[PDB]
UniProtKB/Swiss-Prot annotation, chains A, D:
Modified residues (Phosphoserine): 80, 100
Residue positions where N6,N6,N6-trimethyllysine is found in the record: 114
Name by which UniProt lists this protein: Calmodulin-1
InterPro entries listed in its UniProt record: CALM/Myosin/TropC-like, EF-hand-dom_pair, EF_Hand_1_Ca_BS, EF_hand_dom
Residues modified to N6-acetyllysine: 20, 93
Binding site for Ca(2+) 1: 19, 21, 23, 25, 30
Lineage: Eukaryota, Metazoa, Chordata, Craniata, Vertebrata
BP terms from Gene Ontology: autophagosome membrane docking; calcineurin-mediated signaling; cellular response to interferon-beta; cellular response to type II interferon; detection of calcium ion; establishment of protein localization to membrane; establishment of protein localization to mitochondrial membrane; G2/M transition of mitotic cell cycle
Gene name of the encoded protein: Calm1
Source organism per UniProt: Rattus norvegicus (Rat)
Modification note: Ubiquitination results in a strongly decreased activity.
Covalent link (Glycyl lysine isopeptide (Lys-Gly) (interchain with G-Cter in ubiquitin)) residue numbers: 20
Physiological role: Calmodulin acts as part of a calcium signal transduction pathway by mediating the control of a large number of enzymes, ion channels, aquaporins and other proteins through calcium-binding. Calcium-binding is required for the activation of calmodulin. Among the enzymes to be stimulated by the calmodulin-calcium complex are a number of protein kinases, such as myosin light-chain kinases and calmodulin-dependent protein kinase type II (CaMK2), and phosphatases.
UniProtKB/Swiss-Prot annotation, chains B, C:
Subcellular location: Membrane; Cytoplasm, Myofibril, Sarcomere, Z line
Protein role: Small conductance calcium-activated potassium channel that mediates the voltage-independent transmembrane transfer of potassium across the cell membrane through a constitutive interaction with calmodulin which binds the intracellular calcium allowing its opening. The current is characterized by a voltage-independent activation, an intracellular calcium concentration increase-dependent activation and a single-channel conductance of about 3 picosiemens.
Annotated tissue distribution: Brain.
Family under the similarity heading: Belongs to the potassium channel KCNN family. KCa2.2/KCNN2 subfamily.
Gene: Kcnn2
Effect after changing residue 3 to N: Highly decreases inward rectifier potassium channel activity
Included stretch of the parent chain: 396 to 487 of 580
Recorded domain comment: The calmodulin-binding domain (CaMBD) forms an elongated dimer with a calmodulin molecule bound at each end; each calmodulin wraps around three alpha-helices, two from one CaMBD subunit and one from the other. The coiled-coil domaim mediates heteromeic assembly.
Lineage: Eukaryota, Metazoa, Chordata, Craniata, Vertebrata
Listed name of the protein: Small conductance calcium-activated potassium channel protein 2
Organism: Rattus norvegicus
Quaternary structure note: Homodimer. Heteromultimer with KCNN1 and KCNN3. The complex is composed of 4 channel subunits each of which binds to a calmodulin subunit which regulates the channel activity through calcium-binding. Interacts (via N-terminal domain) with MPP2.
Region (Calmodulin-binding): 11-85
Length: 146, 87, 87, 146
């Protein structure tokens, strides 16, 4: 859990995603705004707890060096295969391991941010490995995460 | 008697949160895969954009799952209280 | 690059919630055990009282654990966002 | 997941723990009050969700027959050994599997609802199986849950 020179500069770009007014400090209010832009809804106490977890000088806000201890402590990443599979499985109506090409088009052209029918063409072309008009999403997710 | 035993642990609002975020997990998984494995030249800015959207959707699904675990334990709390009357 | 990978999942307010409720789990586990196994005649009303308090304390500890899981994933969300800048 | 005659009457006593005004209906407000008396803090949406989960006629409140479907669906119980062990472990300062008799007295006479020094005498007498002034809480919890 030790960091490099390129990452420090990069995590400095990161700090600006959070320090919306640039005073070199991240407040609960700024953290709320960011967390909500990510579609989450932390309470006041939760925001204070996140700050408190890494607030060395205990002045109530996160500065850049406090921001790097959060990062050093947590650089390890993990494969997302299983969670992505579970997201596909939300649309597996019979829980049979398949989503038809037609159903995938329906989902992707109507829900969330959506893709265009053309983007969906490319996605299904990759996903429908057997060319049977059906997507074995477990296999497809394993191809994309390999 | 039941002694120290408690109820075993096995909405429309959450439902639509799930379907929007799940679609978005499909969307961004595809777009990151395409832009990191099916392109000649990787446009890192584009990858970064979809990685932001990807983590946002994954974490939204996590938040829904945790809320359902909380809801379930709240219901188990009611049932555990009702069950004290069996004693 | 990180592609589809995300941050691995491994307060004073919560702290005191935990210690009060944990003590109460010890308290009611003892009092239910005593009143169901160390007494000549079981006073069911007494057992019911301590079963209510027992479930209340167990479920309070559960609520703390779930809140810590939520907090941890919120922090992981921040870290996952910061990490998009490595791309 | 089918219920008996004695349990129906008993679960009728249960219904009155919740139906604080006795109109034969449990509202979000009444559920809040109860859940808070159990030291929990469900939000408005959480209360409505609990009602909604078992509200057949969809009139916004739980009646006694809706109350029994919640129960039928969930009669199965489970052993609490592990969770109780984890509660003791909160007071295991070095994480060595032991809590001294002195520390247990301290905890139990100062925290939570508390016991009297005399109740603690009886508790420690049972817990300190080896008479070494130390409580192997894993073993003690297994004795009480056996
Ligand atoms: Ca700032
Ligand atoms: Ca600080
Ligand atoms: Ca009522
Ligand atoms: Ca109803």
């Amino acid at each position: 859990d030790q960091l490099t020179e390129e990452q420090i500069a990069e995590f400095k770009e990161a700090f600006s995603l959070f320090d919306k007014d640039g005073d070199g400090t991240i407040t609960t209010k700024e953290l709320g705004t960011v967390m909500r832009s990510l579609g989450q809804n932390p309470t006041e106490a939760e925001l204070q707890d996140m700050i408190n977890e890494v607030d060395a000088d205990g002045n109530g806000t996160i500065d850049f060096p406090e921001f790097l201890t959060m990062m050093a402590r947590k650089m390890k990443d993990d494969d997302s295969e299983e969670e992505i599979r579970e997201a596909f499985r939300v649309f597996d109506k019979d829980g049979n391991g398949y989503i038809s090409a037609a159903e995938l088009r329906h989902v992707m052209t109507n829900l969330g941010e959506k893709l265009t029918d053309e983007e969906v063409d490319e996605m299904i072309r990759e996903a429908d490995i057997d060319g049977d008009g059906q997507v074995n999403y477990e296999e497809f997710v394993q191809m994309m995460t390999a | 008697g039941r002694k120290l035993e408690l109820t075993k642990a096995e909405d429309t609002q959450l439902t639509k949160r799930v379907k929007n975020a799940a679609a978005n997990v499909l969307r961004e998984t595809w777009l990151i895969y395409k832009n990191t494995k099916l392109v000649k030249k990787i446009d890192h800015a584009k990858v970064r954009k979809h990685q932001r959207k990807f983590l946002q959707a994954i974490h939204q699904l996590r938040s829904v799952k945790m809320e359902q675990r909380k809801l379930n334990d709240q219901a188990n709390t009611l049932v555990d209280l009702a069950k004290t009357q069996l004693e």
